[PDB]
Design a binder for these strands. Structure first.
Ligand SMILES: [Ca+2]
Ligand SMILES: [Ca+2]
Length: 67
DNA sequence: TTTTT
């Protein structure tokens, strides 16, 4: 898994960006977020994830909120 | 559902 931090998340529309030191930001949609219920992320949150080729370039997958 | 082509 890669380790990063949520750069941006649009709480309303369910997407954002994960920043990874020395790498390009990675796009995250709510559907990638693991866990039950409403799926969301706050800026600054540490996450673990992988990158997948979506329809339109790389996107985050299997995103988990870390301490 | 992009900072997507
Ligand atoms: Ca790792
Ligand atoms: Ca936000």
């Amino acid at each position: 898994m890669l380790e990063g931090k949520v750069k941006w998340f649009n709480s309303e529309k369910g997407f954002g960006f994960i920043e990874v030191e020395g790498q390009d930001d990675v796009f995250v949609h709510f559907s990638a977020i693991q866990g039950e219920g409403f799926k969301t992320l706050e800026e600054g949150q540490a996450v673990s994830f992988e990158i997948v080729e979506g329809n339109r370039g790389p996107q985050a997958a299997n995103v988990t909120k870390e301490a």
